[PDB]
């Protein structure tokens, strides 16, 4: 089970940026996939999960109306998209998965982490 | 909000240390749990403690977790060189202030 | 002194996995070629002085029947005609003769009865199942959605999906328990418990964001979750005042049969009159009352937050909107009109959309094509409960919100099965006694061992044969129960206690096993509690008894050797 | 296509036989064929000439009227067995 | 037109199957046996109407 | 075979279960035996015919 991401990103203010998360090694449709953004010198914060089973999602009110999550069962890959960029966005992002379905709140497997920046 | 204080400490190798994670949920209801996650700068964080005191597989037992209800503690019997890193506690979506350890 | 003594038929049980079986009441799927006639009445029995616990979430019945529904569905669909050849170019235009992108008209070459005879043929489709052939020229070009993914099947026209109120019955040696308390969270202790043999007729209904029909909670509004703290875990809320609702397809439709192959006929859609997208009606005036009541109930669990509802967060069509079936026609109604911080005092109507190719469950191998149904159609029903999912971020404003969700078909059945629970029986009890050798099924469990011992024969006789893709199940059940019963009988025989129920023996009781007040044991204790510690020394006891029998027999023969 | 049939047949026959054996056992008449018991005959069931019954009648004809009171008889026999067993244990309680 | 044109009867109705050449239909004198606990009875009278 | 004198009985050959029982049995054995053989589907093609 490995978690991979796409290369870093740079974009102008006011645009929208997309990033990918490729997963392998187990049933891609059995575990919530979580997203966490870390700015330099800041604590890990939750952005939202997506359940691969049927594309359900969730988001905190902080990011609501700004995020979009989608899945491709063909390539078992998650896509995140953030709109109306602004410096705060600039940070690293990690897609993670939980050890057990029942708890669905741990994080054993982490992608290498991908950085994005504005301008 | 879950609180991890202090933010750091002028540690020295070979000492028993313990840091406190204090929750703020104290509401509704098994029973609430905690997760001590490790992370060195520049790499993926790592899982150290899950549940409340069941440490992760392969972790030196000197790393330990304890507590209940609202007061919990990451603990180390004797801090080694590689152990100097950052750590956080996580009960739910929220995360603590973390802590990093170093020398003068 | 005291003496080991056996009793056969003691009323004790233990939870464990099993396999219940269907029970039904002239062409429907489940009743036909399956299911035995239902018991006219429940032989329900009340068990006072009996406390228990339940875990509706971690349950086997729900999951058990899940794949059962799946399998019956698939098997019923097995013999119908495969629509394989239809995956052909689709030269299409705009519908109507008197742009309405809700449906597109199309025409295409295709195969007659004869291989080398090819004919053109037209048909109307909802824009959903159609797709552009490619990102290429010939905008008229299109293909069915599934073809680049997999094939589908035209359901046999005769079969229907009217959910029958199926019952479930357990096999002998097993009992089904109901927590009578009408305010049980679904995971926890229960005090008022009854026992029945077959589950009440439950309809195998499917829906998202809604619980059509089902049942109310007569007491009040009910809320239950595995853990409402964990935002991810689903929440289910059951209403105590069913809310009427209706939906309809205001169109006059009819099917054109096309012999695609030699004996295989597709059923293309066609319309008579104009085209008006389906819709619904609901008395929002009714809606607001239940909304406010459930909001107060939520506040009870969240004394420092507000309460609201928004549309589905977004995702797959079925999850996003409310999907359901109406007389075998799949409907998807945009539910933004409901989950809002504001409604009207007037009736509320909803715009829905209709699909003809259906992925009944995420795996695509079972892709189905819904045949069109002649003439307009309309279904009236009611709401009893609904599934909610919390946002998961503590707003400083404390504006706590929930959104519709679902998609986990198990939860639908859980919504009702939470009441039931299944256990087995281990009728072999052991106790000390001074002796030395030489109906209301299971009701007596409400008393102590010495007193309850009177009616053991009822449990003994009942537990055997009271019963009288599919066969395998019941055959396994019967064979396994029979094997268990034979095992127990043989164990009784080896102990030389065959043909008896309060058989005394010749092994004195051992202090180490326990030293309780025998008076309490026979008058203050109950088997369910008695067995707990005795469990430890069971094998030692069995060995001692077997040796006793062996030595008795051998000595008898020796003294009678001549 | 084939196995299912004979498997059903064998299982059902075995179940029936076990049911009958168990019914014999509860009546405490296991390991017997002319088991006498401790429930006196009731006149209401019938009052035929016992001589005819044992020397003039045949079972196919005997059973016809007896069918009526079968369940009452079964209950009486079961109670007889239960009371016999419980009383035995009581007198041997010590 | 094309009176030479013809088709198999079933095609406009349904398909059919070519029986495996090896199999044959010689009716074997099958016997039927009842399961235990059941008995098979024969009316010896050779002039029985069949109902009576 | 066993003879049972002093035994009278009755029969209803018409309303009987054995006949019906074996009916579908024959049908099923027939169909199953025909199951593995080759389907003649493709033959449903134009037939340009003449006199034999
Ligand atoms: C059920 O029915 C309800 C009732 O209408 C639906 O709710 C409405 O949904 C629509 C669609 O989202 C929504 O319209 C959007 O409102 C947003 C509020 O700010 C707008 O930001 C958004 O703008 C985009 O769409 C417009 C029209 O499609 C475009 O004109 C606009 O330029 C935006 O699209 C372009 O620009 C963005 C900018 O980044 C770009 O990313 C895009 O790719 C594109 O280039 C829409 O105006 C309504 O506001 C909703 N109604 C209410 C009352 O809120 C609901 O969607 C239905 N759901 C289902 C499942 O049926
Ligand atoms: C929740 O409960 C409500 C309340 O019952 C459910 O709503 C009912 O749903 C049933 C089933 O869809 C529906 O039954 C129809 O009622 C019509 C009213 O007159 C009948 O005319 C109609 O008869 C036709 O369909 C039957 C289906 O088998 C046939 O048996 C019957 O012979 C008729 O058949 C015609 O159509 C078929 C179609 O192929 C054709 O082959 C025949 O030749 C013939 O032309 C149904 O009996 C009720 O009307 C609904 N009642 C209300 C108030 O809505 C609701 O469905 C439940 N919840 C869910 C999710 O389903
Ligand atoms: C059978 O055919 C269907 C046809 O839909 C295939 O599904 C489509 O597959 C294509 C390519 O595989 C997908 O293309 C992607 O579309 C994005 C935008 O369109 C989608 O999103 C809008 C949003 O409203 C929808 O309206 C629209 O219908 C599409 O769903 C593009 O932006 C994508 O490119 C971007 O993302 C990639 C990866 O993140 C980046 O690398 C790119 O640089 C770019 O930023 C992409 O091109 C399309 O989305 C699919 N649609 C659907 C509905 O699934 C099936 O895959 C196919 N299956 C088989 C087995 O044949
Ligand atoms: C597969 O193909 C077969 C081809 O035979 C079809 O069967 C024929 O279907 C046609 C039309 O469906 C039938 O046409 C009728 O024929 C009558 C006279 O011919 C029949 O009777 C003579 C008597 O000797 C036969 O020799 C001859 O083979 C035919 O069987 C016409 O007089 C009929 O019209 C009259 O009756 C109707 C209704 O009562 C009236 O309304 C008319 O006004 C008129 O008085 C009619 O045209 C033909 O009989 C069928 N033949 C057979 C053998 O079945 C199958 O239907 C087809 N099936 C599929 C699934 O494709
Ligand atoms: C769902 O509910 C909606 C309404 O909530 C309903 O559609 C409405 O139906 C009524 C009919 O009961 C329509 O009322 C019309 O009002 C106009 C005045 O603006 C009248 O002129 C109309 O008169 C015609 O219809 C009468 C009906 O008896 C005739 O008697 C008369 O001679 C005329 O032919 C009519 O009364 C109303 O307009 C519609 N709504 C809309 C938006 O058009 C719908 O039928 C319900 N459907 C279901 C399945 O419950
Ligand atoms: C305990 O549960 C039982 C059964 O669930 C309840 O008994 C029913 O009570 C209603 C109301 O009087 C009657 O209409 C039913 O006929 C009763 N059924 C049976 C089987 O007893 C009982 O009322 C409940 N009691 C408490 C205190 O909860
Ligand atoms: C029915 O079950 C509910 C819970 O499902 C019981 O509620 C308890 O009520 C007592 C008395 O007020 C409280 O002390 C407990 O804290 C409650 N527990 C819960 C989980 O709500 C209720 O007592 C039960 N009553 C009956 C008659 O069954
Ligand atoms: C459904 O359950 C709710 C649960 O509250 C009931 O609301 C209570 O109703 C009683 C009497 O009707 C009032 O005394 C309470 O104050 C109400 N509770 C609240 C929080 O307001 C409601 O009446 C029930 N209705 C039905 C039809 O079952
Ligand atoms: C909610 O819908 C129901 C269902 O139509 C309405 O029920 C009516 O209630 C009144 C009040 O006594 C009765 O007189 C009617 O006979 C009921 N009709 C039916 C069909 O049940 C109820 O009025 C609606 N509530 C609101 C607030 O509109
Ligand atoms: C359930 O338990 C209660 C007490 O545990 C039993 O109460 C007995 O009731 C009878 C009838 O009046 C009294 O003579 C007894 O003295 C009561 N018991 C005690 C300990 O005082 C009740 O009988 C039990 N019911 C069942 C069906 O077992
Ligand atoms: C009654 O039926 C039995 C059997 O169907 C007849 O017995 C057979 O009689 C023939 C002729 O003598 C013998 O060859 C057979 O060996 C006998 N078989 C058996 C089993 O008995 C008998 O003859 C018939 N009698 C009458 C009066 O009908
Ligand atoms: C065999 O069966 C036939 C009828 O199947 C019997 O025929 C009866 O013969 C008596 C004597 O003549 C008549 O009184 C009846 O009217 C006849 N009944 C019928 C239905 O034909 C015959 O008696 C039987 N005989 C034997 C030896 O079995
Ligand atoms: C539906 C379809 O296949 N139509 C085609 C048509 O476009 C084409 O012009 C003709 C001759 O090539 O054959 C046919
Ligand atoms: C529907 O169409 C059929 C056939 O076109 C016609 O007989 C019937 O009267 C129509 N009824 C309605 C309500 O459209
Ligand atoms: C609920 O909303 C009201 C106004 O709509 C507001 O005054 C109140 O503070 C809110 N409750 C919470 C817990 O924030
Ligand atoms: C609905 O009517 C009630 C009175 O029955 C009123 O208090 C409420 O404000 C009304 N709301 C709307 C949205 O019409
Ligand atoms: C469906 O059509 C029939 C006549 O074809 C008509 O009587 C009936 O009212 C229609 N159904 C609805 C819901 O309008
Ligand atoms: C049985 O009785 C003996 C008698 O002393 C005692 O030592 C022993 O602990 C008892 N229990 C077992 C399991 O042997
Ligand atoms: C013996 O019984 C006690 C309490 O009944 C239990 O804790 C213990 O596990 C038992 N020993 C064994 C070996 O099961
Ligand atoms: C049994 O004997 C009693 C004795 O009087 C009699 O009243 C009764 O009718 C008999 N039969 C039954 C079925 O009780
Ligand atoms: C009792 O027996 C008579 C004759 O044997 C019969 O007519 C009657 O139906 C029987 N009663 C019942 C309840 O079966």
């Amino acid at each position: 089970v490995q978690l991979v991401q796409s290369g870093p990103e740079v974009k102008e203010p006011g645009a929208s940026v997309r990033v990918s998360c490729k997963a392998t090694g187990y049933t891609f449709t059995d575990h919530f996939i979580h997203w966490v953004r870390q700015a330099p010198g800041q604590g890990l914060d939750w952005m939202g999960w997506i359940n691969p089973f049927r594309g359900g999602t969730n988001y905190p009110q902080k990011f609501q109306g700004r995020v979009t999550m989608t899945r491709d069962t063909s390539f078992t890959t998650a896509y995140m998209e953030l709109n109306r960029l602004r410096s705060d966005d600039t940070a690293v992002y990690f897609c993670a998965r939980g050890k057990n379905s029942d708890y669905n709140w741990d994080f054993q497997h982490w992608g290498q982490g991908t950085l994005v920046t504005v301008s | 909000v879950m609180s991890q204080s202090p933010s750091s400490l002028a540690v020295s190798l070979g000492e028993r240390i313990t840091l406190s994670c204090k929750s703020s949920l104290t509401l509704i209801y098994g029973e609430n749990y905690l997760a001590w996650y490790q992370q060195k700068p520049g790499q993926s964080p790592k899982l150290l403690i899950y549940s409340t005191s069941t440490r992760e597989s392969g972790v030196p037992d000197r790393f330990t977790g304890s507590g209940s209800g609202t007061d919990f503690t990451l603990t180390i019997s004797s801090v080694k060189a590689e152990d100097l890193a950052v750590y956080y506690c996580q009960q739910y979506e929220y995360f603590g202030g973390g802590t990093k350890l170093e020398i003068k | 002194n005291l003496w080991v003594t056996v009793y056969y038929g003691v009323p004790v049980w233990k939870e464990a996995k099993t396999t219940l079986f269907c029970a039904s009441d002239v062409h429907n799927v489940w009743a036909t070629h399956a299911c035995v006639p239902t018991d006219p009445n429940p032989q329900e029995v009340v068990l006072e002085n009996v406390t228990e616990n339940f875990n509706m979430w971690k349950n086997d019945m729900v999951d058990q029947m899940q794949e059962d529904v799946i399998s019956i569905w698939d098997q019923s669909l097995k013999p119908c005609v495969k629509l394989t050849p239809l995956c052909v170019t689709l030269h299409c235009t705009n519908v109507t003769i008197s742009m309405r992108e809700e449906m597109k008209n199309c025409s295409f070459n295709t195969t007659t009865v004869i291989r080398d005879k090819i004919q053109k043929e037209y048909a109307l489709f909802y824009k959903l199942d159609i797709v552009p052939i490619e990102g290429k020229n010939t905008n008229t070009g299109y293909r069915l959605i599934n073809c680049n993914t997999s094939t589908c099947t035209q359901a046999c026209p005769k079969v229907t999906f009217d959910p029958i109120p199926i019952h479930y019955c357990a096999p002998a040696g097993y009992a089904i328990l109901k927590c009578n308390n009408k305010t049980f969270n679904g995971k926890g202790p229960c005090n008022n418990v009854s026992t029945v043999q077959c589950t009440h007729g439950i309809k195998p209904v499917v829906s998202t964001q809604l619980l059509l029909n089902g049942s109310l909670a007569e007491e009040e509004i009910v809320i239950r979750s595995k853990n409402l703290a964990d935002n991810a875990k689903i929440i289910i809320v059951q209403l105590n005042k069913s809310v009427e609702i209706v939906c309809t397809r205001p169109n006059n439709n009819t099917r054109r049969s096309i012999r695609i192959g030699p004996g295989q006929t597709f059923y293309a859609t066609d319309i008579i009159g104009d085209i008006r997208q389906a819709y619904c009606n609901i008395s929002g005036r009714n809606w607001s009352e239940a909304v406010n009541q459930v909001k107060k109930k939520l506040k009870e669990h969240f004394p420092h937050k507000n309460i609201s509802f928004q549309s589905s967060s977004g995702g797959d069509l079925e999850i996003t909107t409310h999907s359901f079936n109406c007389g075998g026609e799949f409907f998807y109604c945009n539910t933004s009109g409901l989950f809002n911080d504001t409604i009207s005092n007037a009736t509320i109507m909803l715009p829905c959309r209709i699909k003809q190719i259906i992925n009944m469950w995420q795996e695509v191998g079972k892709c189905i094509y819904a045949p069109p149904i002649k003439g307009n159609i309309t279904c009236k029903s009611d709401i009893t409960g609904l599934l909610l999912l919390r946002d998961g971020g503590n707003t400083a404003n404390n504006a706590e919100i929930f959104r519709p969700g679902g998609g986990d078909m198990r939860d639908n059945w859980r919504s009702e099965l939470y009441k039931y629970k299944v256990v087995k029986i281990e009728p072999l009890g052991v106790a000390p006694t001074r002796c030395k050798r030489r109906l209301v099924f299971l009701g007596a469990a409400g008393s102590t061992m010495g007193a309850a011992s009177m009616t053991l024969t009822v449990q003994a006789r009942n537990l055997l044969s009271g019963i009288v893709v599919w066969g395998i199940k019941q055959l396994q059940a019967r064979v396994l129960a029979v094997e268990r019963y034979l095992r127990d009988q043989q164990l009784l025989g080896i102990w030389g206690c065959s043909g008896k129920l309060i058989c005394c023996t010749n092994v004195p009781w051992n202090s180490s096993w326990s030293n309780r007040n025998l008076s309490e044991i026979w008058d203050n204790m109950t088997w369910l509690q008695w067995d707990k510690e005795i469990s430890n020394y069971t094998q030692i006891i069995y060995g001692l008894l077997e040796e006793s029998q062996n030595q008795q027999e051998k000595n008898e023969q020796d003294l009678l050797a001549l």
Side-chain angles (χ1 to χ4, degrees), chain A residues 1-103 105-119, chain B residues 1-101 103-104, chain C residues 1-24 27-438 440-562:
Chain A
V1 182
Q2 305 72 0
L3 306 185
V4 186
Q5 303 182 330
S6 55
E9 275 287 0
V10 184
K11 189 65 197 60
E12 280 290 314
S16 309
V17 63
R18 180 199 201 81
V19 70
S20 60
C21 179
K22 180 66 175 59
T24 53
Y26 68 109
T27 308
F28 169 78
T29 64
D30 290 356
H31 308 274
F32 279 53
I33 309 311
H34 276 244
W35 290 85
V36 183
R37 67 184 283 179
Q38 180 177 23
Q42 310 311 318
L44 308 187
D45 181 340
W46 187 35
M47 310 184 65
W49 56 249
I50 181 171
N51 67 331
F53 163 70
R54 199 162 294 287
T57 74
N58 176 10
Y59 321 86
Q61 294 76 15
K62 317 305 289 298
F63 311 159
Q64 177 64 346
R66 300 168 32 84
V67 174
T68 297
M69 297 306 311
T70 64
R71 81 194 184 288
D72 55 76
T73 307
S74 62
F75 314 146
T76 55
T77 286
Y79 297 134
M80 183 280 286
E81 169 47 72
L82 178 51
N83 314 344
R84 294 174 300 287
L85 294 157
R86 174 180 59 272
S87 64
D88 64 70
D89 59 3
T90 296
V92 198
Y93 298 79
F94 315 76
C95 54
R97 177 264 201 206
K99 302 162 62 178
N100 67 53
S101 60
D102 179 271
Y103 187 62
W105 263 100
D106 50 19
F107 298 115
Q108 50 165 3
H109 301 165
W110 297 56
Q112 86 301 53
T114 301
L115 172 59
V116 67
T117 172
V118 66
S119 177
Chain B
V1 183
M2 68 199 313
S3 60
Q4 292 186 229
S5 176
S7 43
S8 64
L9 179 58
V11 298
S12 171
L13 283 181
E15 293 188 357
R16 178 186 188 82
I17 186 57
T18 292
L19 187 139
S20 304
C21 182
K22 177 56 177 300
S23 72
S24 55
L25 164 56
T26 74
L27 286 175
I28 59 167
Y29 305 94
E31 182 55 46
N32 300 274
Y33 298 133
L34 180 142
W36 279 117
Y37 275 109
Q38 169 174 56
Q39 189 196 32
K40 310 178 297 307
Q43 313 76 10
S44 76
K46 192 61 172 61
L47 166 59
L48 271 285
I49 310 299
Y50 56 101
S51 311
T52 303
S53 193
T54 59
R55 70 167 58 86
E56 185 48 67
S57 60
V59 173
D61 291 325
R62 53 182 191 275
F63 299 106
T64 303
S66 305
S68 181
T70 61
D71 322 349
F72 310 85
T73 67
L74 166 157
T75 298
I76 298 174
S77 65
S78 182
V79 304
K80 319 307 186 185
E82 78 303 1
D83 302 329
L84 289 182
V86 195
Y87 306 85
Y88 295 88
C89 54
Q90 174 208 331
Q91 76 185 16
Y92 278 145
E93 54 274 16
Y94 315 100
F95 284 73
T99 293
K100 185 186 69 173
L101 309 174
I103 319 296
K104 181 174 179 182
Chain C
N1 78 324
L2 279 295
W3 291 88
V4 179
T5 316
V6 295
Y7 300 82
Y8 177 65
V10 286
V12 291
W13 62 74
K14 291 184 291 179
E15 78 315 339
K17 180 266 180 191
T18 180
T19 296
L20 282 70
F21 43 101
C22 178
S24 57
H27 185 285
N28 200 335
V29 58
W30 315 279
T32 58
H33 195 78
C35 302
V36 293
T38 43
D39 177 358
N41 67 331
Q43 323 317 333
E44 188 172 7
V45 293
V46 182
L47 281 294
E48 76 161 0
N49 288 310
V50 179
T51 305
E52 57 288 333
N53 67 85
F54 300 79
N55 174 310
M56 69 96 88
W57 306 110
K58 305 195 177 185
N59 165 23
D60 302 347
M61 293 167 284
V62 173
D63 33 330
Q64 183 187 154
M65 58 75 64
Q66 168 52 295
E67 61 281 2
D68 310 357
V69 170
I70 303 305
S71 309
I72 181 57
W73 172 271
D74 168 79
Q75 182 277 356
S76 67
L77 301 180
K78 173 54 173 186
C80 314
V81 163
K82 283 185 284 292
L83 54 78
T84 308
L86 284 57
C87 284
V88 60
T89 298
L90 313 172
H91 172 279
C92 299
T93 72
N94 312 302
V95 298
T96 69
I97 64 181
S98 180
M99 192 174 288
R100 298 289 279 176
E101 272 278 346
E102 314 86 358
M103 308 196 66
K104 281 188 188 289
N105 161 28
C106 297
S107 56
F108 53 98
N109 286 4
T110 170
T111 314
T112 71
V113 170
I114 310 309
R115 311 288 62 71
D116 203 355
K117 290 281 184 173
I118 301 82
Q119 74 297 19
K120 193 175 67 56
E121 169 51 284
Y122 83 84
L124 318 175
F125 307 75
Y126 297 88
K127 179 140 190 180
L128 279 290
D129 295 354
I130 179 172
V131 186
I133 48 178
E134 285 196 352
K136 203 173 63 175
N137 57 19
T138 310
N139 296 327
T140 65
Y142 298 94
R143 56 181 191 79
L144 300 170
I145 177 61
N146 66 294
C147 297
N148 81 333
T149 300
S150 166
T151 185
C152 311
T153 305
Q154 185 178 233
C156 300
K158 184 52 53 177
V159 295
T160 58
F161 313 144
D162 181 2
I164 301 177
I166 305 311
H167 304 63
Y168 273 145
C169 304
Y174 305 83
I176 307 169
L177 319 181
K178 275 182 62 174
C179 174
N180 314 134
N181 181 328
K182 306 304 180 290
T183 62
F184 175 47
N185 72 358
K187 180 197 179 185
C190 274
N191 277 320
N192 189 9
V193 47
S194 70
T195 304
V196 300
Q197 77 292 21
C198 294
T199 66
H200 61 256
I202 180 59
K203 285 181 182 179
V205 188
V206 56
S207 74
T208 64
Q209 316 162 340
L210 286 307
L211 283 300
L212 311 193
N213 306 345
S215 177
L216 294 169
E218 74 301 50
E219 186 63 10
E220 63 164 29
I221 302 180
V222 181
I223 283 169
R224 52 180 56 108
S225 78
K226 176 58 180 66
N227 172 1
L228 78 179
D230 329 344
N231 64 30
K233 256 59 182 177
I234 288 167
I235 317 301
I236 170 62
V237 69
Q238 181 178 6
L239 315 163
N240 53 330
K241 184 163 183 172
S242 64
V243 173
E244 186 181 26
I245 186 177
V246 191
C247 298
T248 182
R249 163 173 54 85
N251 303 263
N252 195 6
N253 303 134
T254 297
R255 57 206 181 186
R256 305 170 52 233
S257 295
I258 300 156
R259 307 179 62 82
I260 82 187
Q264 306 73 43
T265 62
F266 176 74
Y267 291 73
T269 295
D270 191 325
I271 313 178
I272 299 300
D274 60 0
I275 297 81
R276 285 82 55 79
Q277 71 296 8
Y279 77 109
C280 297
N281 275 349
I282 186 176
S283 152
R285 177 59 277 177
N286 259 323
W287 180 271
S288 159
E289 174 59 19
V291 155
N292 199 33
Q293 190 72 181
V294 65
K295 281 205 161 191
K296 295 192 184 301
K297 281 273 289 195
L298 296 165
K299 185 178 188 181
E300 159 52 18
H301 296 353
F302 306 110
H304 306 283
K305 312 284 205 186
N306 300 93
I307 312 89
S308 165
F309 316 102
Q310 324 313 336
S311 74
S312 174
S313 308
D316 311 4
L317 181 68
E318 51 181 329
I319 287 297
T320 52
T321 77
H322 165 202
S323 72
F324 65 84
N325 171 17
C326 157
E329 293 291 2
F330 298 81
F331 284 59
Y332 305 82
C333 300
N334 177 342
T335 54
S336 65
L338 280 293
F339 306 83
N340 319 91
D341 315 4
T342 179
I343 66 138
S344 82
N345 268 269
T347 295
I348 300 302
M349 55 77 63
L350 310 178
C352 317
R353 291 187 294 184
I354 309 302
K355 293 203 300 174
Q356 296 160 315
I357 292 288
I358 299 87
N359 188 25
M360 185 67 176
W361 301 283
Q362 196 56 71
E363 75 308 334
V364 182
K366 306 301 201 310
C367 168
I368 303 108
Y369 168 82
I373 287 173
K374 168 266 290 186
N376 74 88
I377 184 167
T378 296
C379 289
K380 154 173 67 177
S381 57
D382 58 330
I383 306 81
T384 62
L386 58 162
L387 286 298
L388 273 299
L389 182 143
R390 190 165 47 89
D391 267 353
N394 179 328
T395 70
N397 187 25
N398 296 326
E400 277 295 359
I401 316 183
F402 306 97
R403 301 174 180 268
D408 194 22
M409 298 303 92
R410 44 177 48 73
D411 309 5
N412 308 118
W413 312 301
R414 198 187 306 273
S415 334
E416 308 71 348
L417 277 283
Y418 72 111
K419 290 189 183 178
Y420 292 95
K421 183 169 177 180
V422 180
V423 284
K424 58 157 170 170
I425 301 296
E426 305 74 355
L428 284 296
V430 186
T433 315
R434 307 291 298 189
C435 72
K436 185 200 72 56
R437 178 173 49 189
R438 190 181 63 79
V440 298
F441 180 55
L442 206 68
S447 175
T448 52
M449 302 194 287
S453 60
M454 298 301 93
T455 187
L456 298 154
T457 66
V458 168
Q459 297 79 348
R461 64 192 307 271
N462 171 278
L463 60 77
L464 177 57
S465 63
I467 59 186
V468 294
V469 55
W470 273 87
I472 178 57
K473 298 179 285 183
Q474 41 274 27
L475 275 280
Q476 289 170 339
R478 301 165 184 176
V479 175
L480 298 162
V482 172
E483 174 170 341
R484 182 182 182 90
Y485 165 83
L486 267 301
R487 165 57 59 177
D488 310 348
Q489 281 290 302
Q490 185 282 345
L491 288 176
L492 180 66
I494 175 167
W495 286 319
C497 287
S498 64
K500 291 199 169 193
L501 286 304
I502 52 194
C503 184
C504 200
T505 74
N506 311 94
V507 173
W509 177 272
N510 193 327
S511 60
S512 63
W513 303 334
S514 182
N515 306 272
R516 267 284 293 278
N517 180 323
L518 73 171
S519 324
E520 298 183 348
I521 300 171
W522 281 117
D523 311 326
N524 182 30
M525 197 67 174
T526 294
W527 294 100
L528 299 157
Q529 307 69 4
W530 171 253
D531 54 6
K532 65 200 175 296
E533 79 300 358
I534 310 306
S535 60
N536 288 30
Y537 321 90
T538 55
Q539 285 54 14
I540 305 302
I541 290 161
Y542 304 153
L544 293 154
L545 299 169
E546 205 295 329
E547 191 290 330
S548 179
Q549 285 296 150
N550 166 282
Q551 61 79 42
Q552 160 51 236
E553 197 82 331
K554 81 188 183 54
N555 300 17
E556 171 278 353
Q557 168 54 236
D558 304 321
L559 276 295
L560 304 185
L562 293 171

